[PDB]
Amino acid sequence: ESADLRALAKHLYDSYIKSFPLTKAKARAILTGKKSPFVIYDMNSLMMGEDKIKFKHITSKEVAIRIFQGCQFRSVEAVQEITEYAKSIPGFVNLDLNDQVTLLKYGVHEIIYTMLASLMNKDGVLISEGQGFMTREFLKSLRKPFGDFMEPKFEFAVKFNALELDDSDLAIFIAVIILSGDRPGLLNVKPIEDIQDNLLQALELQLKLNHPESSQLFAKLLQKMTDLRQIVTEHVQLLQVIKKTETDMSLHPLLQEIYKD
Amino acid sequence: MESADLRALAKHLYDSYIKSFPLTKAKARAILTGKTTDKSPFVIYDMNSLMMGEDKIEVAIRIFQGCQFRSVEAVQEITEYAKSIPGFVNLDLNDQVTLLKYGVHEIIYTMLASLMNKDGVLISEGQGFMTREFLKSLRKPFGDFMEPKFEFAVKFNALELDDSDLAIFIAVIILSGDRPGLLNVKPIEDIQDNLLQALELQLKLNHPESSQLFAKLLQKMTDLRQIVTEHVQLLQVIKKTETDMSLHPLLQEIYKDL
């Protein structure tokens, strides 16, 4: 069944490429300088970037709020991308429909954090399919709670990126996260855990072949699912604090509805 | 890195686990499943049977303090076991402290599952058995403090690990190079890579029909991390309400800036 695992890995890589706008391979070429992106490093360069490259989400007038809400809009776009990618995982659409919804609901936060790391280095993050680059210092320095909201994302990403995964690795990893049989409220866990066992086999084999000198990388990548669960939990608690504290974050009620999750 | 060397490391760790922990999963299962007249526990299911149990072997505080005493004992045993893990005592001393500070609680929960089934937990080296329902029914926050341990244990026990498995698994948890404040992560990760290699081979040989148990067991390190956090948060709440309990200095230090 070795060749079947390679097939599953090839299938997932191909679908991963079509589903997501900016791959890790392309992002690394931009970050390293190998078409130069617009750099956002302060207030004035932000004002020119939306006026020049036209970042879609520009509708509050405060800077830190607008950036945070920009992160919200992009995450909503990513949810739809992850949802399309999930449909291509062998077995997923044959699951009970409520269970498909449940796996996506509880998994998107972990996948967004994972995939965001592909767009970051220690100095900033790519935005708008790589045309912009927002510096870590500028984000880290936003006022009151917003500065401390951005920086944990970078600290996770730098640690995660030290594993040096490529897109073919990440496609199987993302699928493994989706097929988590321990999400609350699953109706039929058995076929989810069955698919995950296939995906885990595919990830293990892929990592031995693609990183043969990287001892126990499979184990180390699974240990990063501990980090993911913990930071997703910390993330939710920070959103709750931001909602309860800030009143200058009223949006149109229909816009609030799009962002409900 | 060679197969026979991994088997040697598994046997070393299993042997040391036996010397360090007096109540094994093997012994606990023999008591729990029964059919033995000689190993049969006294069952504590209410207030009066608790009163009879002390003659044989406030309530919620007394039980909570009993868990504190046992946890201190567990730390001592876990610490003795850690010293036997090849390479651990050769590490920088501050890192040795750090690995223990962050590892002991995750290990206590792991080994506590060995003493539980869905209906209760063995106590006092297997001589007693306290029902889950009784613990769940303790007053104010103490009732809910006991129960999350049970929820993990039922899931964890479904993996059907035995002691030779748990010996390597416990060592892997201790040698975690991602603990906060470690000074030299590289020598810790090198040891874990051997321990991880040892666990993988051990699970393959001992559970050949249990597909991807290695991966599923590592995913359980996630459930451990979450319940330690929920535990620490519950203690902080109990402290602000109760002064009628101090904590043992060993436990006091483990929680400092955890």
Ligand SMILES: O=C(O)c1ccc(-c2nn(C(=O)c3c(Cl)cccc3C(F)(F)F)c3ccc(Cl)cc23)c(COc2ccccc2)c1
């Ligand atoms: O392109 C992508 O793949 C992409 C994916 C994730 C993020 C992003 N999400 N995010 C979260 O807080 C967040 C997370 Cl991690 C998980 C779930 C929900 C949230 C939510 F809802 F609360 F936002 C961030 C926090 C800090 C930073 Cl530096 C980045 C993000 C981004 C940024 O996009 C921007 C676009 C324009 C201007 C500024 C940022 C891109």
Ligand SMILES: O=C(O)c1ccc(-c2nn(C(=O)c3c(Cl)cccc3C(F)(F)F)c3ccc(Cl)cc23)c(COc2ccccc2)c1
């Ligand atoms: O034998 C063992 O290895 C063994 C190991 C852990 C526990 C135990 N600790 N514990 C904690 O709350 C606790 C924890 Cl997990 C970690 C650090 C500090 C605490 C603290 F501070 F609060 F005490 C529990 C809560 C609920 C239950 Cl069901 C069990 C325990 C037990 C119980 O032992 C008993 C002995 C006599 C009477 C009743 C119970 C045994």
